């Protein structure tokens, strides 16, 4: 692709009897978090979470903090409205999540924008790819849709995604270029773990890679072993990089028929590995 993304992820959660709903936001460029805000912080403020954003001046942090405080209030009204749209009790805890942002290509041009919401973990409403129209999941979301149509909300959302979001993403990519534009390839190896006299596990490891997107596959005699491969979810190491493994159970003596194939944007060419007994 050469492409990049910026995303904001908001979570509001009600907690009847335990105060007003908590609002959390995090911002990402690609797989790198760069800001947070938490309404339960002793002094809620947007805070930097990557080195390259620390250079933004006080006006940045002050503006953004005001935006999140207003957003938290709007989300509290949204949660009240949603409880009513679903005929729900005031006794229960409910969750509103929102995700929005933009994708750009290597030249900085908009590829697409996103602006969508979920209620209790279920898709609720989304801005369509055209940035003009909405898709509502159910008759409750159709209320929101009618209100947002009447107010021409999508126009403001389009303007943000095509203007602000792309312009600030481009700035972040320039300021963070040494890390955000650097792919770190996986360090790979294969381990062997006897299970019984007649079978063993071959585990293909990928360590230390960024971004998180990777493909690890095993082949037997050149045929992909999809149903027989155990994959773990890609996981963060805590130093910006990610880890993953894929395993297969193989008959004793047949190890050399199996190859692990690794694809990652940090690799000029995909890797083929095998178990190397010493």
């Amino acid at each position: 692709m050469g492409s990049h993304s910026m995303r904001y992820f908001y979570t509001s959660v009600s907690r009847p009897g335990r105060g007003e709903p908590r609002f959390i936001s995090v911002g990402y460029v690609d797989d790198t978090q760069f800001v947070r805000f938490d309404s339960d912080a002793a002094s809620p403020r947007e805070e930097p979470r990557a080195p390259w954003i620390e250079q933004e001046g006080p006006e940045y942090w002050d503006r953004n903090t005001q935006i999140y405080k207003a957003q938290a209030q709007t989300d509290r009204e949204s949660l009240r409205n949603l409880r009513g749209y679903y005929n729900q009790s005031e006794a229960g805890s409910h969750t509103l999540q929102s995700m929005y942002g933009c994708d750009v290509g290597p030249d900085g041009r908009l590829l697409r924008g996103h602006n969508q919401y979920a209620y209790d973990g279920k898709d609720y409403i989304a801005l369509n790819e055209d940035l003009r129209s909405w898709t509502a999941a159910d008759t409750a979301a159709q209320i929101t849709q009618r209100k947002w149509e009447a107010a021409r909300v999508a126009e403001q959302d389009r303007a943000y995604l095509e203007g602000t979001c792309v312009e600030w993403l481009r700035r972040y990519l320039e300021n963070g270029k040494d890390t955000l534009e650097r792919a770190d390839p996986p360090k790979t190896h294969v381990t062997h773990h006897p299970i019984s006299d007649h079978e063993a596990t071959l585990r293909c490891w990928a360590l230390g890679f960024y971004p998180a997107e990777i493909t690890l596959t095993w082949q037997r005699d050149g045929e992909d072993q999809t149903q027989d491969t155990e994959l773990v979810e890609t996981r963060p190491a805590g130093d910006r990089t990610f880890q993953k493994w894929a395993a297969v159970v193989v008959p004793s003596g047949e190890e050399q028929r199996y190859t692990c194939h690794v694809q990652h944007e940090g690799l000029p060419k995909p890797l083929t590995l095998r178990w190397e007994p010493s």
């Binding site: 940045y60 935006i67 999140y68 949204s78 409205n81």
Partner: peptide
């Protein structure tokens, strides 16, 4: 930078 002036659902 986040979006300003969002509307309630």
């Amino acid at each position: 930078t986040p979006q300003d002036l969002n509307t309630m659902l």
